Design a protein around this ligand. Structure first.
Ligand code: CLA
Ligand code: CLA
Ligand code: CLA
Ligand code: CLA
Ligand code: CLA
Ligand code: CLA
Ligand code: CLA
Ligand code: CLA
Ligand SMILES: CCCCCCCCCCCCCCCC(=O)OC[C@H](COP(=O)(O)OC[C@@H](O)CO)OC(=O)CCCCCCCCCCCCCCC
Ligand SMILES: CC1=C(C/C=C(\C)CCC[C@H](C)CCC[C@H](C)CCCC(C)C)C(=O)c2ccccc2C1=O
Ligand SMILES: CC1=C(C/C=C(\C)CCC[C@H](C)CCC[C@H](C)CCCC(C)C)C(=O)c2ccccc2C1=O
Lengths: 73, 141, 163, 80, 73, 739, 73, 40
């Protein structure tokens, strides 16, 4: 029972990381200083600057659900 | 340019057997594009849709369904063969529009006649937050 | 004892697990001849297994109802009931080694950045310098508190921010 | 029906104009820079949203931004 | 599918079916009212997450109820 | 035609070893980001991108290929060596049926000695499944001393191959003219390599392997065997075995070849003792094969004014419907390496697939059919190698269309006309995949739904609405009744899979007739579904690599690029590289079921222990009834046969139990890369760089998230590795612990 | 079923709080009004929060898996 | 030789020597002193 309660802690702390990041970095990132002008949900800013796939805060929520399901599992 | 060149809809086309990347029902109903240029000899070039074709000495004419298909060919001719193409837009009603060298000079060269459009006099960033414009459209304009 | 756990010496399942694991080898040992190398290999494994079980019992470990040894983590109960070597002491054995790796890599980074072309020094290391720092890091806790009390450990708002 | 706005930091490189296939962008004179040039976006109705323009701008942060929006036949790149 | 395979493979494929629907002798008489295009980028992340999560749930619900009901303990 | 070489082109020194990235102009500057590291190991062997010169690209290629041979030869010598010193070959040779092979004994540190299982023969080690022991017995090898010498030869030849790669690049490298002499390659590589190489092996078969295996099969002890050189020197010894040797090459030159009927035979079938092909038949095979390739090598023109020219052949086979046909291909194939690599990999991968089928039904080596783990491991191996090689053709053909395609040479050509009706190809091929996936896989769902509803009479099965493969059944009988009529001199048929009686060896069946029914109909049609689809993904990428309606200029973007942009609704995974990245997932889904087909079919209907009353198969013949339902594949194949893997803890098969789990981790681990994107990760690193910056411990090489195409590649790699390694553990543990 | 039903819902709901909390920063957040307060002081040093979180996820992840794998072997 | 020593100073070569050291050290510390769990 010890190892699982700690493995559960892995889920909550990293699931929070994905969602907290998508919130605080919602207004802007160094890769995209103005996310606020675009919106909550947009696909990307293009292949420039090395690639900008899955930056928006919607894409953070999108990735957390995989961890939500893993954690609850 | 000095004056817009009107369209000559009856000019010889290149020697091309045909393909499946041609025009669809959208062309007859909505709009289609045509490109003109003048070559000094008989050469071979890659088409955007399909394979290879043989130009003809003198004027040449093609018909495309997209503007990108036309400008893709201009970049090939301006670079490889160093020519000066010009293409139009034809609607279903028969109306014709002269698009790309609209001033006669290509867009990558300045000209005194042009007037600026969509020019913000500020730095990127440095603009109001969305809350200020929360109930109408636009934070960038 | 503590937490309703028996010592491993007094447990029955602990000795049951020993008699089982040896019975597997004795059955496996019957196939081969006495003086052959497979016989010598299995006898050594038998010798190691007999040594593993007696040493864990001698060390005052705690075995549960399943018969396997359990570890205790609170230093209070560990020190009170003489179970410190399990978790509490190895905690300091690691952190000495881990900070060794940080104090070394931090110094190689700072010193190469004081010269021209530090990018080349990362892909093509200065091995004489790396060995020098690697043998000078035996007393990294002294240098850390020296660098903290001095104030040259941390940078002060000369770092990039995003907004 | 996309939006293209150019900002005060343009330096007249012309790399945005050379990159756009659909001829959305052109150069206009201006007094703000050394090159005495500035871009413009007169015909955004033909814009498609490739963001090759943003890829070419060498500024610290971009003098050109394509703000995506409502779609259309020309914007979706539909031959049909 | 929606998670791994992304849009650009499919829109080129739908362009090929469109060609066939127009060149076929009798089917060409029928014509769509709204033009067919592939699903957007953000839509696919949503759709694929729904097909993902629903199988994550319908699978475990059957196992949870069947394992416990058959043994009755 | 002549030899042409350029002396001392390149100096040999370690100067460029210190300067990584010298081959590329961009990388020679140096690193300012960590992306420079990934691009280094990636663009290392892309010689076409380094330089435009075709000559230098040819020198580099011809010398790198020498490296793979040296890499192979030390690997091959390792097996011979590890088989000599750390194995039980001499014990297995005297009792093959009861003793199992082993050549990888393990050292005694933490645990790890239990893996040295009780193999048998006064020896304990890992049980191998590579079939070397049966290979070394097919040739005359009785002692370990022969294996040592064979290993020392490989190291000697391998260093020569490495030496040549230095010599034929750094010192004396050929010219482009020497490479374009294509007609001489086929002449030398057919006659010399395939012709004489097969003729030579017949020499080893005739003079060494036949007598040795004749005595071994007659119960003689290996140590009492005369050494193979004695058969050469003494014409009297081998004459006692095969009396035809007493005549001594007079039958050959007088053209009375019937005298050699003793050891040149057309028996067919299998040996009753070893459960393998008659060694006399193979010496006849490789002998006739040599005469066939020798004449083939005297076809072309090279220098003496006789023979064919490939150019005149190609530009003479023309047609009306094709127009100009096959004309500009000799200029293509003599100029681009990628074109040849596409053709060759396609037929080098489809060949290993042919090897996999034609060995299991026709076991060439002795005591292979009774080693079910070996027979199952060679099939699975040489099939996967075929899938990868075939997929490489779709990748290494698209590179030709992007880089080495000149429209001037191709006007109204075959290649040009294919592109001009490409939309008809992909459209007509799209309909087939939908037709098959409905009428093939939908039949499985129909059987599942009918069974759950209590209507088993309405399923597709033998006791039911039977769909029997009449065509294959007719071909089985035709090849079975061939010795009577179509091949009178054949004593028996090619294999027993067509029809006949059982061949038992050591109480185990080597091969017995395979019956085809309703289930075999569905599976053989499921394979075509996965194949016609895997072609759709690759063929679409090839034709639409150079241009499409969505993106009329892809060739300027290149072979591998992630996307043009979010516009047009989205242009992600539009390149030809991303088509290959998708085709690998379908190759995996295809061969994974070709492999499950081989395991359950052969366990249930073929393999098993023969008793007085018939044969007792491993799974009791459940392929006919259970396979029609998908739940059957889940119950009777996966849940059932996984008992040996799961219960492997505490035994010699414990390594397979761990690999079974670790293969799942690496599979799921790939999902982070496929589902996610570069954007989230590059921002996360910024918040991490802050802490590394706060403590003045930060890298001068800036950390950057992986590129888009790399995240896709990293996914499919960890994906396929975890998916394939699971079978590798699920199979060997299941089959080594027989049943 | 009553346990899994509520817990799977507890995860879905809780992933919405952060998501709908991220939309606040884009649409309904005014920095000049909320200047110097707790909400701006959190958003100022977000690089510390996201970093110290990543330590806990990595720490639990390595050491928990390493023990299970140590026991598997 | 100056360039050879420089090649040996690259990242992967130095990492190889590190790995043989740390791995061989841990193994030989488990070859002798077998099965440590509690530290005396
Ligand atoms: C010691 C002798 C020697 C020396 C000093 C050189 C020196 C040089 N060679 Mg040469 N070469 C040699 C032997 C040598 N070569 C041999 C034996 C061959 C035949 C294979 C070649 C074939 C050859 C070619 C074809 C080329 C060179 C090139 C070069 C130059 C670049 C070297 C470089 O990038 O380093 C590279 C340093 C290395 C250490 C490379 C190691 C590669 C090994 C073989 C891989 C090992 C496989 C691994 C174990 C598998 C496990 C991995 C797993 C994931 C599967 C340089 C002048 C290149 C050139 O002309 O410069 C533009 C070039 O194109 N050489
Ligand atoms: C089994 C699959 C799997 C695994 C192992 C991980 C693992 C991880 N994910 Mg992840 N993820 C997955 C599936 C998985 N994910 C899926 C399907 C999704 C949905 C797209 C995501 C979405 C996702 C997001 C959005 C985020 C993560 C994050 C993380 C990290 C959490 C920190 C942690 O505990 O690291 C330690 C735990 C480990 C298990 C470490 C793996 C390495 C072990 C020790 C093996 C070491 C290698 C060994 C020496 C052999 C190497 C040899 C080889 C190179 C040849 C971690 C690397 C978060 C992150 O990176 O923040 C820090 C994060 O933000 N993941
Ligand atoms: C979060 C960490 C943590 C936790 C949860 C515990 C938990 C516990 N400790 Mg403990 N301890 C810790 C860290 C921790 N310790 C550290 C870092 C030290 C210093 C080495 C100690 C030193 C220590 C001693 C000396 C003793 C405990 C004792 C105890 C137990 C009784 C309650 C208590 O502490 O007194 C109430 C605390 C109120 C603040 C309890 C199991 C006692 C014990 O043995 O319990 C029977 C005891 O005598 N602890
Ligand atoms: C009878 C003559 C002969 C023979 C036997 C070969 C044999 C071979 N050639 Mg080849 N070739 C020949 C004539 C011949 N060639 C001619 C005339 C030309 C020019 C027209 C070429 C041009 C050529 C190219 C361009 C390439 C080959 C390659 C190969 C190898 C393919 C590897 C393989 O399939 O695994 C079979 C492997 C073996 C059987 C192992 C044996 C290896 C030994 C060292 C080879 C011994 C034969 C050798 C050619 C004899 C002369 C060498 C001597 C002068 C020192 C194979 C060894 C490829 C290569 O070099 O890969 C490394 C390759 O890329 N050939
Ligand atoms: C005769 C075989 C052959 C040859 C000579 C080449 C040669 C080439 N290919 Mg090609 N290819 C082949 C077969 C071949 N390929 C096959 C069978 C496929 C299908 C899978 C492909 C698919 C393919 C693609 C998709 C691409 C290439 C590319 C390239 C070029 C760059 C090489 C490169 O980056 O590698 C340098 C070396 C590496 C990158 C290291 C590879 C590491 C692999 C992925 C890991 C192996 C894992 C290991 C086996 C198991 C795990 C254990 C691990 C812990 C060690 C080069 C011209 C690329 C290119 O740009 O072409 C112009 C490209 O984009 N090829
Ligand atoms: C189990 C998962 C799954 C399934 C079912 C499919 C299904 C399909 N994929 Mg696919 N794919 C998947 C995973 C899956 N994919 C993954 C994970 C990847 C990533 C590598 C891909 C990548 C991929 C590519 C790259 C391509 C496909 C293609 C296809 C299609 C092939 C045409 C065909 O046979 O359809 C026929 C229909 C079926 C197979 C459905 C089976 C179930 C039954 C028959 C449906 C029953 C309907 C029911 C009676 C009606 C109920 C109505 C109700 C509302 C009342 C098909 C739609 C190809 C495609 O679309 O082009 C042709 C293609 O090119 N897939
Ligand atoms: C022979 C085949 C081969 C293989 C398998 C590799 C593999 C690798 N090279 Mg590489 N390389 C090769 C040939 C090869 N190279 C050649 C011929 C050259 C030209 C001289 C180079 C030049 C080169 C440079 C210049 C660099 C690499 C780096 C790397 C590593 C990538 C960084 C990484 O993921 O770690 C990331 C690592 C960390 C984030 C932290 C450090 C911890 C590491 C993992 C411990 C050390 C690992 C050790 C080297 C593993 C043993 C070797 C292994 C292949 C068996 C990777 C291990 C990079 C590197 O730093 O290597 C370590 C690097 O900068 N390579
Ligand atoms: C969280 C990860 C983790 C941790 C904490 C441990 C901890 C331990 N393992 Mg384990 N292990 C792990 C992961 C881990 N392992 C993994 C991932 C595997 C599979 C690869 C193994 C496989 C494994 C085996 C097979 C064995 C261990 C052993 C050990 C013990 C050896 C102590 C030692 O080296 O002597 C102490 C060494 C020193 C004090 C010297 C280091 C200090 C320098 C010199 C300064 C120790 C309890 C051994 C043991 O005794 O188990 C009880 C053993 O036989 N482990
Ligand atoms: C494996 C079985 C697959 C069969 C079903 C596949 C149908 C899909 C192909 C349709 C393309 C049709 C347009 C043709 C393209 C075409 O117009 O080319 C024209 C070509 C005739 O060419 P000409 O003689 O004009 O010129 C040839 C010269 O150009 C030489 O280069 O037609 C054929 O070769 C007929 C091919 C029939 C192809 C069907 C058979 C292919 C499989 C071969 C085995 C068949 C017999 C099997 C029974 C044992
Ligand atoms: C298959 C596929 C398509 C094409 C898929 C299409 C066009 C299927 C959608 C249309 C069909 C006809 C709907 C099928 C009906 C559904 C089963 C039920 C829908 C119910 C809703 C009405 C509620 C994409 O557009 C795409 C985009 C981005 C990433 C991945 C993909 C992707 O994988
Ligand atoms: C995780 C992830 C990253 C981040 C991944 C990174 C930065 C790679 C990390 C590589 C590490 C540095 C390799 C070394 C790992 C271990 C340290 C090796 C073990 C060494 C010890 C034994 C010493 C991306 O950049 C990305 C980009 C696009 C799509 C998906 C993804 C994606 O999923």
């Amino acid at each position: 029972d010890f190892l699982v309660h700690h493995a559960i802690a892995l889920g909550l702390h990293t699931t929070t990381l994905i969602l907290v990041k998508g919130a605080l970095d919602a207004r802007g990132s160094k890769l995209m200083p103005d996310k606020k002008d675009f919106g909550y949900s947009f696909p990307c800013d293009g292949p420039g600057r090395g690639g900008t796939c899955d930056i928006s805060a919607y894409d953070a929520f999108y990735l957390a659900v995989f961890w939500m399901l893993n954690t609850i599992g | 340019p000095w004056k817009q060149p009107e369209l000559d809809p009856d000019t010889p086309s290149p020697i091309f057997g045909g393909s499946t990347g041609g025009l669809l029902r959208k062309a007859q109903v909505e709009e289609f594009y045509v490109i003109t240029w003048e070559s000094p000899k008989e050469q071979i070039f890659e088409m955007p849709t399909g394979g290879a074709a043989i130009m003809r000495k003198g004027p040449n004419l093609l018909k495309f369904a997209r503007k990108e298909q036309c400008m893709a060919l201009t970049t090939q001719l301006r670079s490889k063969f160093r020519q000066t193409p010009c293409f139009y837009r034809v609607y279903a009603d028969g109306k014709v529009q002269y698009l790309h060298p609209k001033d006669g000079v290509y867009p990558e060269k300045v000209n005194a006649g042009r007037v600026g459009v969509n020019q913000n006099m500020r730095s990127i960033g440095k603009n109001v937050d969305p809350i200020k414009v929360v109930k109408f459209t636009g934070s960038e304009p | 004892d503590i937490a309703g756990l028996t010592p491993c010496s007094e447990s029955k399942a602990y000795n049951k697990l020993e008699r089982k694991e040896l019975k597997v080898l004795d059955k496996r040992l019957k196939q081969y001849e006495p003086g052959s190398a497979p016989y010598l290999a299995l006898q050594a494994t038998k010798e190691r297994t007999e040594n593993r079980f007696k040493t864990y019992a001698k060390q005052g470990l705690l075995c549960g109802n399943d018969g396997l040894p359990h570890l205790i983590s609170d230093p209070g109960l560990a020190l009170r009931f003489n179970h410190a070597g399990e978790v509490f002491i190895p905690t300091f054995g690691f952190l000495y080694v881990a900070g060794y790796i940080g104090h070394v890599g931090r110094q190689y980074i700072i010193l190469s950045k004081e010269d021209a072309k530090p990018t080349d020094k990362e892909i093509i290391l200065d091995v004489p310098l790396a060995l020098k720092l690697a043998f000078q890091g035996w007393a990294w806790p002294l240098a850390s508190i020296q660098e903290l009390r001095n104030g040259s450990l941390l940078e002060k708002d000369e770092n990039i921010t995003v907004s | 029906a996309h939006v293209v706005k150019i900002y005060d930091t343009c330096i007249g490189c012309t790399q945005c104009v050379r990159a756009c296939p659909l001829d959305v962008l052109e150069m206009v004179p201006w007094d703000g820079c050394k090159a005495a040039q500035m871009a413009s976006s007169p015909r955004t109705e033909d814009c498609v949203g490739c963001k090759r323009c943003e890829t070419a701008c060498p500024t610290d942060f971009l003098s050109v931004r394509v703000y995506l929006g409502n779609e259309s036949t020309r914007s979706l790149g539909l031959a049909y | 599918m929606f998670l791994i395979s992304w849009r650009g493979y499919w829109q080129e494929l739908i362009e090929t079916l469109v060609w066939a629907h127009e060149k076929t002798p009798l089917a060409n008489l029928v014509y769509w009212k709204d033009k067919p295009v592939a699903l957007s980028i953000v839509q696919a992340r949503l759709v694929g997450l729904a097909h993902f999560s629903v199988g994550y749930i319908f699978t475990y619900a059957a196992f949870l109820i069947a394992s416990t009901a058959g043994r009755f303990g | 035609v002549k030899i042409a070489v350029d002396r001392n082109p390149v100096e040999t020194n370690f100067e460029k070893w210190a300067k990584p990235g010298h081959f590329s102009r961009a990388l020679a500057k140096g690193p300012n980001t960590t992306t420079w590291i990934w691009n280094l190991h990636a663009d290392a062997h892309d010689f076409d991108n380094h330089t435009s010169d075709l000559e230098e690209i040819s020198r580099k290629v011809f010398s790198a290929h020498f490296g793979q041979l040296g890499i192979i030869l030390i690997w091959l010598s390792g097996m011979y060596f590890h088989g000599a010193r750390f194995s039980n070959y001499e014990g297995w040779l005297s009792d093959p049926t009861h003793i199992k092979p082993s050549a990888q004994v393990v050292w005694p540190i933490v645990g790890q000695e239990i893996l040295n299982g009780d193999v048998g023969g006064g020896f304990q080690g890992i049980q191998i499944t590579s079939g070397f022991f049966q290979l070394w017995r097919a040739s005359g090898i009785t002692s370990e001393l022969q294996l040592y010498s064979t290993a020392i030869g490989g190291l000697v030849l391998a260093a020569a191959c490495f030496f040549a790669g230095w010599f034929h690049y750094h010192k004396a490298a050929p010219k482009l003219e020497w490479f374009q002499n294509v007609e001489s390659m086929l002449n030398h590589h057919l006659a010399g390599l395939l012709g004489l190489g097969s003729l030579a092996w017949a020499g080893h078969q005739i003079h060494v392997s036949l007598p040795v295996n004749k005595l071994l099969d007659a119960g003689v002890d290996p140590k009492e065997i005369p050494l193979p050189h004695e058969f050469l020197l003494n014409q009297s010894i081998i004459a006692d075995l095969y009396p035809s040797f007493s005549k001594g090459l007079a039958p050959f030159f007088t053209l009375n070849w019937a005298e050699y009927s003793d050891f040149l035979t057309f028996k067919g079938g299998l040996n009753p003792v070893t459960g393998g092909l008659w060694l006399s038949d193979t010496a006849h095979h490789h002998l006739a094969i040599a005469v066939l390739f020798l004449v083939a090598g005297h076809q072309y023109r090279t220098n003496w004014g006789i023979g064919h020219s490939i150019k005149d052949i190609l530009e003479s086979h023309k047609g009306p419907f094709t127009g100009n046909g096959h004309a500009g291909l000799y200029e293509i194939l003599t100029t681009s390496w990628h074109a040849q690599l596409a053709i060759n990999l396609a037929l080098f991968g489809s060949l290993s697939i042919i090897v996999a089928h034609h060995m299991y039904a026709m076991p060439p080596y002795p005591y292979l059919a009774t080693d079910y783990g070996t027979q199952l491991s060679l099939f699975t191996h040489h099939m996967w190698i075929g899938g990868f090689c075939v997929v490489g053709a779709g990748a290494h053909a698209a590179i030709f269309m992007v880089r080495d395609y000149d429209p001037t040479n191709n006007y109204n050509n075959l290649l040009d006309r294919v592109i001009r009706h490409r939309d008809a190809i992909i459209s007509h091929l799209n309909w087939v995949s939908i037709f098959l996936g409905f009428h093939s896989f939908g039949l499985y769902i129909h059987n599942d739904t009918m069974s759950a509803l209590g209507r088993p009479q309405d399923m597709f099965s033998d006791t039911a609405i039977q769909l029997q493969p009449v065509f294959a059944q007719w071909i089985q009988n035709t090849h079975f009744t061939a010795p009577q009529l179509t091949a009178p001199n054949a004593l028996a048929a090619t294999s027993l899979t067509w029809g006949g009686d059982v061949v038992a060896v050591g109480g185990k069946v080597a091969m017995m007739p395979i019956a085809l029914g309703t289930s075999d109909f569905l599976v053989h049609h499921i394979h075509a579904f996965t194949i016609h689809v895997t072609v759709l993904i690759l063929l679409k990428g090839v034709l639409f690599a150079r241009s499409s309606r969505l993106i009329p200029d892809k060739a300027n973007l290149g072979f591998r690029f992630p996307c043009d942009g979010p516009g047009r609704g989205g242009t992600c995974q539009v390149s030809a590289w991303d088509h290959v990245f998708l085709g690998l997932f379908w190759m995996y889904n295809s061969l994974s079921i070709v492999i499950f087909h081989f395991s359950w079919k052969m366990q249930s209907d073929v393999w098993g222990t023969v008793t007085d009353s018939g044969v007792s198969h491993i799974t009791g013949g459940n392929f006919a009834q259970s396979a029609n339902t998908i739940n059957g594949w889940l119950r009777d194949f996966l849940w059932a046969q996984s008992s040996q893997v799961i219960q492997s803890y505490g035994s010699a098969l414990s390594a397979y139990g761990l690999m079974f789990l670790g293969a799942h981790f690496v599979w799921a681990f790939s999902l982070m890369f496929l589902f996610s994107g570069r954007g989230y990760w590059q921002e996360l690193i910024e918040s991490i760089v802050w802490a590394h910056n706060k403590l003045r411990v930060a890298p001068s090489i800036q950390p950057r998230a992986l590129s888009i195409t790399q995240g896709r590649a990293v996914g499919v790699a960890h994906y396929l590795l975890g998916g394939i390694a699971t079978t590798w553990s699920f199979f060997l543990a299941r089959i080594i612990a027989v049943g | 079923s009553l346990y899994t039903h509520h817990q799977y819902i507890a995860g879905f709901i809780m992933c919405g709080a952060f998501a709908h909390g991220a939309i606040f920063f884009i649409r309904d957040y005014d920095p000049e009004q909320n200047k110097g307060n707790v909400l701006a002081r959190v958003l100022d040093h977000k690089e510390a929060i996201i970093s110290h979180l990543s330590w806990v996820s990595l720490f639990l992840g390595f050491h928990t898996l390493g023990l299970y794998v140590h026991n598997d072997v | 030789m100056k360039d050879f020593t420089t090649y040996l100073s690259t990242a992967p070569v130095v990492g190889l020597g590190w790995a043989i050291f740390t791995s061989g050290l841990l193994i030989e510390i488990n070859r002798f002193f077998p099965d440590p769990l509690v530290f005396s």
